[PDB]
Structure formats: structure tokens, C-alpha cells
Amino acid sequence: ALDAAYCFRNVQDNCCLRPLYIDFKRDLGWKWIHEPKGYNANFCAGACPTQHSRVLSLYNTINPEASASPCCVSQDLEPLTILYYIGKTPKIEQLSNMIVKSCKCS
Amino acid sequence: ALDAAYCFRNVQDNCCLRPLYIDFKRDLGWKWIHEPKGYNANFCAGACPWSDTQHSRVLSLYNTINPEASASPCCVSQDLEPLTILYYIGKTPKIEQLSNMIVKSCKCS
Amino acid sequence: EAVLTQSPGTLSLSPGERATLSCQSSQSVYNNNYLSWFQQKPGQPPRLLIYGASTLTSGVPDRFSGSGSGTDFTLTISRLEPEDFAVYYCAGGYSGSSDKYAFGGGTKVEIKRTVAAPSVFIFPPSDEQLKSGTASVVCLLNNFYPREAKVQWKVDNALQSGNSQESVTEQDSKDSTYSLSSTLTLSKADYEKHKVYACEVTHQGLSSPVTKSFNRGE
Amino acid sequence: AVLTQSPGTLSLSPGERATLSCQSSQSVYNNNYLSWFQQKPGQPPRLLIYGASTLTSGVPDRFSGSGSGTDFTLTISRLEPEDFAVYYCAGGYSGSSDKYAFGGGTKVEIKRTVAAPSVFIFPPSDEQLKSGTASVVCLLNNFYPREAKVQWKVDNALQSGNSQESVTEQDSKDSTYSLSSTLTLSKADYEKHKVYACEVTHQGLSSPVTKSFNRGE
Amino acid sequence: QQLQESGPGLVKPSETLSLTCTVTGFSLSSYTVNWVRQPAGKGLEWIGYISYGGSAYYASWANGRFTISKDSSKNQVSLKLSSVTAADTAVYFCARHMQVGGAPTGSMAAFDPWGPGTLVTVSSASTKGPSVFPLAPSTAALGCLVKDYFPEPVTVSWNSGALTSGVHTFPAVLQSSGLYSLSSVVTVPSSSLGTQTYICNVNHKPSNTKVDKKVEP
Amino acid sequence: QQLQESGPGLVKPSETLSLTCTVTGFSLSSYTVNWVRQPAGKGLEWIGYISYGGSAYYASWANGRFTISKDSSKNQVSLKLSSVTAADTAVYFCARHMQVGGAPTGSMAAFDPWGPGTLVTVSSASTKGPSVFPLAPSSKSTSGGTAALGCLVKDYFPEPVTVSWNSGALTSGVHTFPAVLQSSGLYSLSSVVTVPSSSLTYICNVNHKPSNTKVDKKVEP
């Protein structure tokens, strides 16, 4: 898969997961989160040399007039657990789809 | 929202659903498929100036605040649908459901 | 990858005659009908005539028609009009990761006329040109037919090679003939070394090669 | 986002402390996205300091940066002759366009003891005299300060608007300058006169020095 | 309904060629746009396309030297060609696929409309006016030899446009030197040599040169 | 770790400028590459970048005229400038962000390494090679018996010319002056050297890449 394990120590130019650390206060302007201060959001990027993308890739070779060319984009997303305060009361929340875990050419 | 109802009415330069008819024998070389002869697969294409997931909104915000922007968005599939087909094993008919064959909606990711 | 061979290279016909142009593809075109015909006039882009082997484009006269499938195609002009003398190209559409389309080499539809031997003329280098450092000897073959003609340069005895370039005009829009010029280029020093300069002309319309000559400094 | 660098120019002796200011119109990202560069003529800039105060690998200890937010300072504690350059600051910002911007630069010149130029005059070559133009060259070699008055005289007549000057950068070690003054005349005017003189006035010379030649011998 | 190619007249070898195709009356999201070149005296050669869907395809001979792309917001299709040689001298056309992409029926290798074409000349030679020489008569023939000019476009007329019959202006030839050369001739009654003035009017616009020569026995 | 700019050198007004920056020793998927220009006698100006992640960002003054993109399969970053003007004459540099993108600590507005820079002259004028003339040696009778000699490199366009002495063997005491723009629209410069008067073989190696000119002039008394 195009994940952290495959991509991170193997920096190449084709579609891959790329590291991105985001600081909540500095980068997003989200001043309310207590923990963590930031997190590894990551992103997908690179060249692209599902069944729909596989049929599009075959159609683009067989038909003289190709349709769309593939994009490097997020495949699997993961939640991020945070700690914030409502007054002086602690509140743990799982924020959905905050992290990209793997990429795809689509 | 970037579906056939919205896109196939006004040809827009920005991201969204594009019609595409695929003939199995002519376009894919899949000569063994008895039914259907082809289908409306569609595709996604166009400029992304347009924020579906929390991660996409985060990246979009980060790209404006950090001096060093990360990735830029592009037009890709959002909702997919299967396609049922019919083929024969000798004279025996076989019905199969192929998942994620049709693109119903697009997004900027 | 795919190659479209148009035959013949040149088709010489009179207005009113039937024209048939062939196009043969090395591999079958996509869907056996991805083949179009185009006409091209000088200084203009190509004009679309027929698409999908046999469908006439709007505004194209009915005298044009196309036929064929797979690898063998023909364009027919039922009765040639004067405006139909032009270069015609076929274009094929193909499967692949490259070479989605290809054009054939083209077929020139030329105006037919009688064999005409050229009127030959030789021109020695000008007084003005010798003043620089180069010498050009010009041989003019005026208003002939067919296009094929041979020019051999002869200095004293020696047949020349690599020091001449020839140029042909388009068919004249009044008498449908060609005119050819061949220029022999030599340096001022290489030119003063010899005396008799001759243009030997071979054409269909000549019984024996024609010679026009001068003695340097006449 | 505008970075203002001050002073525009500073001239200081080897051993002195150079203090360069950089004022950002808006806060730099994370208050420390400010870097310092040194640029020598015809060369790409050299990174010195990053993150307002972090010294780049191999950069001498005499360079140090400080400040946070909007007010930044580059200090060169014990100036060396090789430190002549134009110094630039660059800031990092949030935004849809101006992610980065450079300051206008501060030119640092090294002060040295006044040195008079060695003066040479070169007639036009016979090669050039075949064409229609005659170039007469005056060279002012290894002097300080940069200020120098060069006057051309052709048969004791002062020349005006027919000469151009060019100056080298300061030398890396001795801090001196060199200058060329070129008098352009038509070959016909050149061959109509006899004495060609270049008169040099400089702080290192008690009175002007003239270097001349006579065309012909 | 319209396409217009634009580019530089000349490119020096090894440099990169950039061409634009400005589109009017149709959407680039609906139609595939192609590049087709035509070297002097040769046939049409398909280079590649940028599809209605954004996919770029090229001829196998392209060897990755070409990039075809588009910008819908500007109604522009681009061609970028790197490491340009003399073999790249040609008229470059942009041609639209006849029909919209994606339907059960395609364009069937039809291209319509086409742009007028843009001439690209790859050469290290510099813009130079021609030297024209008479080709003196002894029916007689006479003419002018329009030699050593750059770039390609020259116009030749006789007697200020008045003489048109029997006029034959030959296609130019590219010489080993990189300069062009052509001849213009005219057959006239031998009896008119001496009373009828014969002058060849040569104009080379790229160098602003206009030279007219009398041709007499 | 290297960056190297390539460009046409001379561009006609209103035409498209196309620059290339060839990268060695680092991946474009790890680092952002910026374009910075510097007009003659002016300061550095950030034009924009193509980020490690593929995002292009430009200075406000760019006004859509610039396009910065990359092709990591060719190890190349590009800059495309439409409708050039005299105002676009400048040295254009390629400069990398100091650190890899996306790490908790960014590059902190630092750029390193930089390319050597490529000069772009926007002009209707054509390429002209120089004439190289000697500056015959002028000897000193005392003060160490030195002699100054040189070469005048006259009437070339566009800039630059490079001058060396005795194929690079002679470097001490060499003063190659900045080029001056003459009233004719062509450049001129002198390169001088001080040698012992006692030794009076000295050749000045002149190279004008735009016109493919290479002159080896022997300077003698």
C-alpha cells in the first residue's frame, strides 16, 4: 500500500504518503485544544504512471481519445484523539478523518 | 453535489462529473461480457479553486497560514456504484457484481 | 508504430475525370472506421472532407466519397473540378500508449497536360557577385511537363556533384507547366580556374540531352 | 509584507562592530521566520543565519542574529576585510501570495588607510585603428577611497562626454579598488592629435598625476 | 469555432520552444486539442493532444521532448518543445477533434477546425537582408538571384508590380551556411531588351531591406 | 546538492520566457524550490515557489504572468513568464528551501543552496560577438619593475563575457572590470593584469557564449 511504512524512508517521485506535522495554534488558529500541540496530518502527492480507475487506465490506452489522467489523493483516513477544556472541565474527543493513512492514484 | 443533476446541465471548467460511455469489447477488450454491451462509467475532471473531509479543510487552512504550502487539490471520484454483468460458462449464465465501476459524484481532494 | 501508405504519390488527371486515391494502414484502425480525409492547398491549413471512412463533412460537395474498413481505404472524386487539384491526406486513429493518430504521406492530384520539353537558358555569375567571393551559375528550364527533369553541371569536362541545388515551381495557373532553376555554387577562386561551363538537361520531351554553355569572361 | 533594512550603507574598519537592522511591517510566521544572507558581486546569496538567531554550518562565530516578531538585528562583532557585501534579510509570512519577501539590503564597505592609485595609460591598438574607432584606456590600480577624478586631455584640451568609467569591487584582503576610464574617439580624430593625457585627482595624491603618450613615437 | 496559434518567429538550437493556441467558441472541457506540424515541403505530422478530460498523449518519435497542456480559464492550449534542432523547423498547427469527447460515438480521426498555422524556424543564423544580382539576358529570359538572406520570407515583383506575365519566382533553398537563396525570372520578347526597362523589386521585411535592380543585356 | 538555471539569455519584448532549473542530489518531492530575481544594481525579489507537495505560490506583483511548476521525472523546476518587457531584464536565481518540507521545524525563511543565476536580457537587438584588442604592456622603471597589460573586449551583446589569462594559470593581480553599456547599445569591458616587466607569453582567453565566440588574444609589446 502507499502508506507511511512504504513511503517515508523511500522518498521517490510517484504518488506517496508525505509527512506533514501541523501545529494547532501556529498553523490552524485553533487555540482551544490543550493536547496534543500538533499532529502528523500527512498528505498525498506525486506522479501517477479502484475498479473505475483501472477501467479508465485501460480505456485511455485502447481508445484513441483518452479521458481523465490519474491524481494522487487520500485513500484511508484516521481519527485523532484530542483533549480540550469547557471551562475547567476536561473533555476528550475523537476528531474524525483528521489524518491521511494511505494514498491512491485515482 | 458535483453529480449528473448539477454537472450534465451546464458545461463548467471547474471540477465535476463528466459523461463517459465505455464499450466493453471496443474500449476494454473484454469480449467475454454478454450483458450489458457498455455502460456510463463517467469520470471526474476540472479546476479546483470548491472541502468534503476534515483533513481536506485542514490542508486548505494550513496552505494559507504556513509560508510553505503542502499539496494542491484535484478533481477525483467521491461516490462510486457497482455494475452487474452477465457472462456465460459454456451455455451456463453467470451474473457478477463488479464493485466501484461507476462514478456518481466528484470532489476536490 | 502504425503507418498509412497513400498511393499513388502523384495522380495526374484532367478536370472532368474520375480520381481514386488509396490509403492502406499497417494495422487496423480503431473500430475499423477511424479514418478521415483532408485536402490541403498552399499556405492553408488542411480541410476536413470525410470522416469515419465514408461520412461527408457538411458543405463538402457530393462528388467526394470515401469507402473501406480495417486497413484498406479509398477516396473517390467522381468528376474532378479545377479547385480539386491539391494534396490529399488520410489520418488514422489507433489504440496505444503513444501514436493515437497518424497521417499518411499524402497524394498530390496534379493537372494533366501534354509532354513539353523545356526552353533552356544559362546565366553566368554577375559582375556584382564576383566582387564578393562566391559565384553562382544559373540554369533555367522554363515551362515544361512532366515534373521529372535532370540537370548535370559540366565544367570543361568534369561532371559536377554536391555543388548544385535545384528548385521547382508549382504548376503554372494558365498553362499547367513547371519551371526549374538549378544553381551551381563555386568560390570566386574555384570559378576562375576553368573556362567552359555547361548545363546538360535530360527530360521526357527531349530526344538527346540539351546543352547550354558559355566560356567564362565572354 | 515589507522588510525595511537600515542603514542603506555602512563603512567600518576591520575590528569594528557592524549592526544591521531589519524591520518587518507585519509579524513573521512563528515570530522567528527571518533569515540573513550575504551577497558578494556576481554570486548567489550565501545563507548566514536562519530562524532569527541560528548560525548556518561553517558561518564564522562573529556573525550573530537576534529579535522576535518584527524587529531583527544582524551583528558582525569583529569585522574582517572579506566581510564587504550586501546583506539581506528575508521573512516568512502567512497568506495567499507573499509567502516570502526580501529586505532592500545593507551594503557593508570595509574602511582602510588611504592608498594612492598606480596610474597607467594605454594607446589604441593598431588592430582597432583599422576599424574607425580608437579607444584610449586609463587604469587607476589598487587605491582607497573609491572617490577619484579622472580627466582626459587631448593636446591640453579637456574632453567632455566621450569617456566612461568602470570600478572593480573591493579586494578581499587589501580592501582597495581599481578603475578604468576609456576615452572613445573616431580613428580620424585620434590621428589628428598628438598628446593624450589622463589626469588623476585622489585623496592619496598631494597634487594631480598625469600619464600621457604622444601618438607616433 | 476558432483556434489561433502564436509563438516566436525564431528559436536558436538547444533552446526551448513555447507555442500557444488561443481557442474561441468552444470549451476545452468538452473538446480534445491536437498539435500537428508540417516541415517545409513535407507532409502533416501529428505531435500529440491534450484531451477534453486532461490526458496528454504523444507520437512515439516525440521522445519526451514535447509537453502539451491547457488552461481552460485562459482558453489556451500550450506546446513546449525542449532541446530544439534544425529538424524542428516547421509550420505548427493546432487542430480540434471534430466532436465532443466521451459519447458512444467519437470523432473518427477527424480534426476540425484547424488554426492558420505558425512558422517556427530553428537556426543560429542572424537576421540579414539579401544581396540581389542580375541574371542578364543574351524570346529572352532574364532575372535576379536573391541570395544570402535570413529569415525565410522574401517578396519579388517586376517593374513595380506592372510586369506579371511569364514571371517565375522559385521556392527558396536553405544553404549549408544557414542563409536562404532564391531566383526570380521572366521571359520577354528579345526585341524589347534596351527599350523596356526591367527591374526586380525585392523586399525582405524581417530586416527592413528593399533593393531594386536593373537587369539589362 | 546543486541547482543550475538554464535560459535563452536574450528574449524579444512581448514573447514568452522559459527558464529551467536542473536539480542534483535532492528530491523535488522533499524540497520546495523558489525563483528569485535580481535586476542590475537592485536587491533580491522573491517571485514564487513550487512546494515539495506541488503547490505553487507567487508574489502579489506577479499578476498571473508567472507559472512555476516541476517535473521530478526530469529533475527539473520551471518558470514561464508571458509577455516579457524591459522591466523583466534581471538575473534569475533558483533557490531551495533549506530544510525538507512537512517536518515540525520548517525552513524558517532560509534558502540554501542557490543556483549560480542566469541573466535574461529582454531586447529587440540581436546577438553580436566581441572584438578583442590588446592593451600593450606599460612598464614601471622603479617601484618593483612591474608592468600592466590587458585586453579590451569591445562591442558585444548581450552580456556576459568571461575573461581568463593563460588558460586560468594567471589569476593574481587580474582586474576584470564590470561591463559598461556604450551609447551604441553594445557592451565593453577591459581585463587588466600586472606582471614583472622582466618577463615581457600572455594570452587573454575571451568567451562570449551568446554568439559562440572564443578569442585567445596574445598581448605583446
Side-chain angles (χ1 to χ4, degrees), chain A residues 1-8 10-30 32-106, chain B residues 1-9 11-50 52-109, chain C residues 2-218, chain D residues 1-77 79-193 195-216, chain E residues 2-217, chain F residues 2-208 210-221:
Chain A
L2 301 175
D3 53 22
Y6 177 78
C7 302
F8 284 4
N10 182 202
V11 61
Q12 45 74 267
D13 303 297
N14 292 341
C15 180
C16 245
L17 188 66
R18 312 289 175 179
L20 178 64
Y21 179 88
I22 294 191
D23 190 276
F24 289 118
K25 294 168 214 147
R26 206 179 291 164
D27 299 319
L28 305 181
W30 293 4
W32 52 275
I33 302 173
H34 186 257
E35 277 299 298
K37 305 298 173 66
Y39 80 114
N40 299 291
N42 305 331
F43 67 96
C44 294
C48 284
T50 189
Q51 260 277 52
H52 179 268
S53 288
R54 288 179 147 184
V55 336
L56 264 226
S57 89
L58 185 55
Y59 176 94
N60 286 354
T61 67
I62 291 166
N63 200 281
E65 190 180 6
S67 59
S69 63
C71 256
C72 186
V73 297
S74 308
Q75 161 70 291
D76 298 328
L77 307 173
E78 261 204 3
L80 173 77
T81 294
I82 59 138
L83 167 74
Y84 68 104
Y85 285 84
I86 294 156
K88 297 299 167 289
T89 66
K91 180 72 182 275
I92 295 165
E93 205 157 308
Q94 271 197 73
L95 301 181
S96 303
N97 303 324
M98 282 292 282
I99 300 164
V100 178
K101 189 200 167 84
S102 64
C103 302
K104 62 180 187 175
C105 278
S106 71
Chain B
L2 300 169
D3 50 22
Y6 177 88
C7 296
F8 298 0
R9 152 198 63 86
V11 180
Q12 152 102 258
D13 283 332
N14 292 335
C15 172
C16 94
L17 197 64
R18 308 291 168 182
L20 177 64
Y21 178 84
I22 294 181
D23 191 276
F24 287 132
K25 177 157 186 286
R26 296 198 265 94
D27 298 327
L28 302 176
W30 296 3
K31 284 166 188 66
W32 52 280
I33 299 163
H34 204 251
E35 292 296 336
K37 288 279 112 74
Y39 80 116
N40 290 312
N42 307 320
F43 68 91
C44 297
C48 281
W50 186 255
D52 181 51
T53 60
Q54 179 72 79
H55 186 274
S56 300
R57 301 192 295 270
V58 165
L59 281 190
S60 194
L61 180 51
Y62 175 93
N63 284 356
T64 61
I65 301 178
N66 198 282
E68 197 182 356
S70 55
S72 50
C74 69
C75 197
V76 288
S77 59
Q78 178 188 44
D79 300 326
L80 300 145
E81 278 189 4
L83 179 80
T84 314
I85 60 133
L86 173 72
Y87 65 94
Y88 281 78
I89 296 157
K91 298 271 148 177
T92 305
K94 180 72 220 302
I95 303 159
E96 206 143 79
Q97 233 211 0
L98 311 167
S99 322
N100 300 318
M101 289 288 277
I102 303 161
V103 44
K104 299 298 266 77
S105 66
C106 303
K107 62 168 184 189
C108 288
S109 181
Chain C
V3 296
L4 296 136
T5 296
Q6 286 181 250
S7 67
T10 299
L11 194 61
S12 310
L13 297 170
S14 280
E17 298 197 66
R18 189 170 112 110
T20 74
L21 287 83
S22 161
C23 178
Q24 278 182 14
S25 188
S26 55
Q27 64 166 290
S28 301
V29 290
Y30 167 87
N31 194 42
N32 304 302
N33 77 328
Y34 271 51
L35 195 105
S36 283
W37 293 93
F38 303 85
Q39 179 191 79
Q40 196 184 32
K41 301 266 179 101
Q44 270 163 233
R47 176 202 174 187
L48 177 60
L49 301 176
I50 282 139
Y51 69 87
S54 57
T55 312
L56 255 195
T57 298
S58 287
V60 179
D62 230 324
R63 68 185 173 265
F64 291 90
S65 64
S67 68
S69 45
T71 60
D72 309 345
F73 300 92
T74 308
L75 168 71
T76 292
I77 311 170
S78 70
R79 310 266 190 269
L80 276 288
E81 291 288 325
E83 59 262 47
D84 303 340
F85 296 92
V87 180
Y88 291 88
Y89 295 96
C90 65
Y94 305 96
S95 297
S97 49
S98 261
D99 298 318
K100 292 301 206 179
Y101 300 96
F103 287 93
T107 288
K108 177 170 192 198
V109 172
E110 199 224 49
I111 300 142
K112 182 155 81 67
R113 77 166 321 275
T114 36
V115 176
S119 73
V120 181
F121 303 92
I122 187 160
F123 301 94
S126 338
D127 309 313
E128 296 158 41
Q129 198 197 2
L130 292 158
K131 303 189 303 189
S132 310
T134 51
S136 305
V137 203
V138 174
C139 188
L140 174 64
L141 282 64
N142 206 54
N143 287 240
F144 64 93
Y145 193 91
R147 192 180 181 274
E148 197 285 301
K150 184 183 86 195
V151 170
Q152 317 164 86
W153 285 95
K154 174 215 162 79
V155 61
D156 285 334
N157 164 278
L159 221 160
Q160 308 299 97
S161 56
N163 48 0
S164 69
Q165 295 178 292
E166 60 182 49
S167 173
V168 199
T169 191
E170 283 305 286
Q171 261 184 314
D172 197 355
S173 71
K174 53 185 79 66
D175 49 60
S176 308
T177 62
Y178 296 94
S179 291
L180 180 142
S181 61
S182 179
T183 310
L184 178 72
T185 198
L186 300 169
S187 196
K188 188 197 184 150
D190 297 276
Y191 173 79
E192 278 168 68
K193 280 215 283 280
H194 308 93
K195 182 203 175 73
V196 49
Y197 287 85
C199 183
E200 198 87 18
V201 172
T202 59
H203 186 240
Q204 174 58 55
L206 295 174
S207 180
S208 290
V210 168
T211 298
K212 283 286 177 169
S213 71
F214 67 91
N215 299 319
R216 182 192 64 84
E218 348 129 73
Chain D
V2 181
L3 298 149
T4 310
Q5 280 185 258
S6 59
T9 50
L10 58 82
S11 36
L12 304 168
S13 316
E16 271 194 278
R17 181 164 284 245
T19 297
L20 285 72
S21 300
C22 180
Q23 312 274 298
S24 196
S25 67
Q26 68 170 55
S27 287
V28 299
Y29 167 89
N30 191 43
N31 299 318
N32 71 345
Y33 268 50
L34 200 281
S35 288
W36 290 98
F37 302 81
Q38 178 196 66
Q39 190 185 30
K40 287 181 167 290
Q43 277 217 300
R46 170 186 187 205
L47 170 68
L48 301 169
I49 299 277
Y50 63 83
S53 56
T54 314
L55 200 75
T56 286
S57 175
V59 173
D61 206 329
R62 64 181 180 274
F63 292 96
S64 80
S66 67
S68 175
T70 246
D71 282 23
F72 301 89
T73 55
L74 171 73
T75 295
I76 317 160
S77 62
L79 212 61
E80 299 235 77
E82 321 82 46
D83 299 337
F84 78 90
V86 178
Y87 292 85
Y88 294 94
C89 64
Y93 305 96
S94 301
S96 49
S97 58
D98 304 289
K99 296 300 215 180
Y100 299 99
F102 287 93
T106 291
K107 186 185 177 81
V108 176
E109 191 242 41
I110 308 304
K111 283 177 168 156
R112 80 167 312 263
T113 60
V114 172
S118 286
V119 189
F120 307 75
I121 193 156
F122 307 92
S125 54
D126 298 308
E127 291 100 312
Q128 180 186 39
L129 292 176
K130 292 155 74 184
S131 72
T133 43
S135 296
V136 197
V137 177
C138 188
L139 167 74
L140 283 66
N141 222 15
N142 306 319
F143 63 98
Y144 191 91
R146 200 180 239 212
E147 207 192 292
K149 179 185 166 185
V150 182
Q151 292 206 316
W152 282 101
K153 284 181 175 75
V154 180
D155 288 325
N156 307 128
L158 177 72
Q159 296 302 289
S160 184
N162 56 357
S163 62
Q164 294 179 286
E165 298 181 353
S166 196
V167 196
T168 54
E169 73 195 67
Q170 266 183 312
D171 191 57
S172 64
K173 202 50 218 57
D174 61 46
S175 298
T176 68
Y177 297 95
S178 286
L179 186 148
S180 66
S181 182
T182 310
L183 178 69
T184 314
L185 306 162
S186 56
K187 145 187 75 200
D189 194 26
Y190 175 71
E191 298 179 357
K192 275 164 51 87
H193 297 278
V195 183
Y196 287 80
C198 173
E199 188 177 300
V200 176
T201 310
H202 185 259
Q203 201 176 53
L205 304 160
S206 276
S207 60
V209 340
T210 303
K211 292 295 154 112
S212 70
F213 66 84
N214 278 44
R215 181 195 46 89
Chain E
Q2 191 102 81
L3 292 96
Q4 186 69 63
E5 307 83 344
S6 44
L10 308 161
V11 213
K12 285 186 175 81
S14 282
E15 307 305 343
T16 70
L17 171 63
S18 305
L19 302 183
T20 307
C21 179
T22 307
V23 146
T24 324
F26 67 96
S27 169
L28 294 170
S29 299
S30 280
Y31 292 94
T32 297
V33 182
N34 303 262
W35 285 98
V36 175
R37 74 188 194 177
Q38 183 162 36
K42 293 182 119 185
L44 298 169
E45 300 165 348
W46 177 85
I47 297 168
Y49 60 65
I50 180 83
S51 86
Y52 65 111
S55 311
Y57 277 80
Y58 307 98
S60 52
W61 58 260
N63 284 119
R65 282 205 303 131
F66 289 86
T67 313
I68 300 164
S69 52
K70 67 180 180 182
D71 194 326
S72 233
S73 69
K74 296 197 264 185
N75 283 326
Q76 288 185 358
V77 173
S78 288
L79 176 45
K80 178 192 194 185
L81 169 59
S82 68
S83 181
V84 119
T85 74
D88 296 311
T89 299
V91 178
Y92 284 80
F93 299 98
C94 54
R96 196 196 78 194
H97 259 53
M98 170 184 75
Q99 274 292 341
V100 300
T105 304
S107 287
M108 266 88 75
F111 302 114
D112 196 30
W114 287 73
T118 183
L119 181 64
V120 165
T121 309
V122 182
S123 160
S124 38
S126 186
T127 301
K128 179 171 154 181
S131 55
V132 353
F133 310 106
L135 299 168
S138 88
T139 315
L142 59 103
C144 280
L145 173 58
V146 181
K147 201 193 152 86
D148 292 348
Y149 65 88
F150 195 86
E152 232 280 68
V154 299
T155 285
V156 189
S157 96
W158 287 85
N159 294 168
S160 334
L163 181 57
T164 63
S165 52
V167 173
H168 293 299
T169 305
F170 296 101
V173 171
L174 183 47
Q175 307 163 273
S176 313
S177 66
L179 309 175
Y180 292 92
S181 152
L182 65 74
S183 276
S184 184
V185 299
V186 62
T187 42
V188 296
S190 181
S191 72
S192 81
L193 263 60
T195 53
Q196 189 86 244
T197 295
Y198 297 101
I199 295 166
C200 63
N201 324 103
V202 183
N203 207 306
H204 183 249
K205 282 290 200 287
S207 75
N208 295 359
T209 317
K210 190 185 179 287
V211 285
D212 317 315
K213 302 284 177 171
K214 69 180 188 182
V215 183
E216 330 211 294
Chain F
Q2 218 172 294
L3 294 110
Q4 177 68 246
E5 314 84 337
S6 280
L10 184 54
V11 192
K12 296 199 169 284
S14 84
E15 291 316 307
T16 293
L17 171 64
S18 177
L19 307 183
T20 295
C21 168
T22 303
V23 147
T24 304
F26 70 91
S27 169
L28 294 174
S29 291
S30 283
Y31 296 92
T32 291
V33 174
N34 304 256
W35 286 95
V36 177
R37 75 177 179 191
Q38 186 167 40
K42 293 262 169 278
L44 303 163
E45 45 203 44
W46 184 80
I47 296 162
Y49 60 60
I50 178 69
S51 87
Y52 69 115
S55 300
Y57 277 78
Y58 303 94
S60 286
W61 61 264
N63 253 107
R65 297 211 296 124
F66 295 88
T67 305
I68 304 173
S69 58
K70 70 184 163 173
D71 194 348
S72 47
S73 75
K74 297 239 274 149
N75 267 353
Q76 283 177 8
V77 162
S78 305
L79 176 52
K80 181 182 186 282
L81 178 55
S82 67
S83 317
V84 298
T85 180
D88 301 305
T89 298
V91 163
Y92 286 79
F93 297 100
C94 196
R96 201 194 73 185
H97 263 50
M98 176 192 75
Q99 260 286 18
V100 305
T105 301
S107 288
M108 285 133 134
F111 306 103
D112 194 29
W114 287 70
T118 201
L119 176 68
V120 169
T121 301
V122 177
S123 186
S124 309
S126 53
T127 287
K128 192 194 167 299
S131 279
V132 183
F133 304 126
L135 294 167
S138 185
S139 294
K140 241 155 61 180
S141 73
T142 64
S143 300
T146 66
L149 58 97
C151 282
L152 171 62
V153 184
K154 206 179 128 77
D155 296 339
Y156 62 89
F157 188 86
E159 282 205 75
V161 287
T162 63
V163 188
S164 84
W165 285 93
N166 293 343
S167 299
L170 259 286
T171 60
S172 60
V174 180
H175 291 293
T176 299
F177 294 95
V180 305
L181 187 57
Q182 303 163 120
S183 61
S184 63
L186 311 155
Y187 289 91
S188 192
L189 68 72
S190 280
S191 177
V192 304
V193 65
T194 55
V195 304
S197 178
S198 294
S199 68
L200 305 167
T201 180
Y202 295 104
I203 291 171
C204 72
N205 322 105
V206 179
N207 197 45
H208 185 236
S211 66
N212 295 59
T213 303
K214 188 210 278 178
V215 189
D216 289 49
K217 189 75 190 170
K218 192 170 88 193
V219 185
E220 47 196 359

